[PDB]
Design a binder for this molecule. Structure first.
Ligand SMILES: N[C@@H](CCCC[NH3+])C(=O)O
Length: 238
């Protein structure tokens, strides 16, 4: 008994995973994976755009049936929702102006203004570790606002998923004068293990269908065909 239409929520400000083109159509690797899985599940799927911090509330309230939005699988989130198997890996990394001395450390960042997406694992990490100790951690409604304020000089640094910053900003016109500041921030407790489809705990039939379709499209080589459209390295990690 899967729904006739599966309603999938995503936050369309995280290119190359989820964004909108000039006509307002949904585009990106998350959209490609969701649509291929819906095709293999033989269900119809509707995409619903939402701010990132409204996604798990909307899911719990049944306004959407699944979340595909670079949603990291963490211990905290598993207390509330269920996840498909891993869609791809996601590490966190700081970005700042080229030549910046900034490092992901308290000593480097105390007194700096650091942007993080509201509702993200990065906001959790930065609030506990940095905001309490005097770093000015600023939470934003979406990631595009973070990049705009960084280039405006209102932020000194921003923490987000590494590949989103790389492909969605650093390799773009707008990020030419910016770079990663230090290596990926590893913290198992905060950042979890890769991203997955977020689902209500009791929708075990829907999880089984997403997991089976994901195995099948990885198996026959469709995942790698799709990933190569955006990435030249293995995004899945393994
Ligand atoms: N992967 C991070 C950021 C995803 C942001 C997507 N708009 C998290 O799960 O919180």
């Amino acid at each position: 008994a899967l729904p006739q239409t599966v309603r999938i929520g995503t936050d369309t400000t995280y290119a190359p995973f989820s964004s909108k083109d000039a006509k307002g159509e949904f585009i990106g690797f998350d959209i490609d994976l969701g649509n291929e899985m819906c095709k293999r599940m033989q269900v119809k799927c509707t995409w619903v755009a939402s701010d990132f911090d409204a996604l798990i509330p909307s899911l719990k309230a049944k306004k959407i049936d699944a979340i595909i939005s670079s949603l990291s699988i963490t211990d905290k989130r598993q207390q509330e929702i269920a996840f498909s198997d891993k869609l791809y890996a996601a590490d966190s990394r700081l970005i700042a102006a080229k030549g910046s001395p900034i490092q992901p450390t308290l000593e480097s960042l105390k007194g700096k203004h650091v942007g993080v997406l509201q509702g993200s694992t990065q906001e959790a990490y930065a609030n506990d570790n940095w905001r309490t100790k005097g770093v000015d951690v600023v939470a934003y409604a979406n990631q595009d606002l973070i990049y705009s304020d960084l280039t405006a000089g209102r932020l000194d640094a921003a923490l987000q998923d590494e590949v989103a910053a790389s492909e969605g900003f650093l390799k773009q016109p707008a990020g030419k004068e910016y770079a990663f500041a230090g290596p990926s921030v590893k913290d198992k407790k905060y950042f979890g293990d890769g991203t997955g489809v977020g689902l209500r705990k009791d929708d075990t039939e829907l999880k089984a269908a997403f997991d089976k379709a994901l195995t099948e499209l990885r198996q026959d080589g469709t995942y790698d065909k799709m990933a190569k459209k955006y990435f030249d390295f293995n995004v899945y990690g393994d």
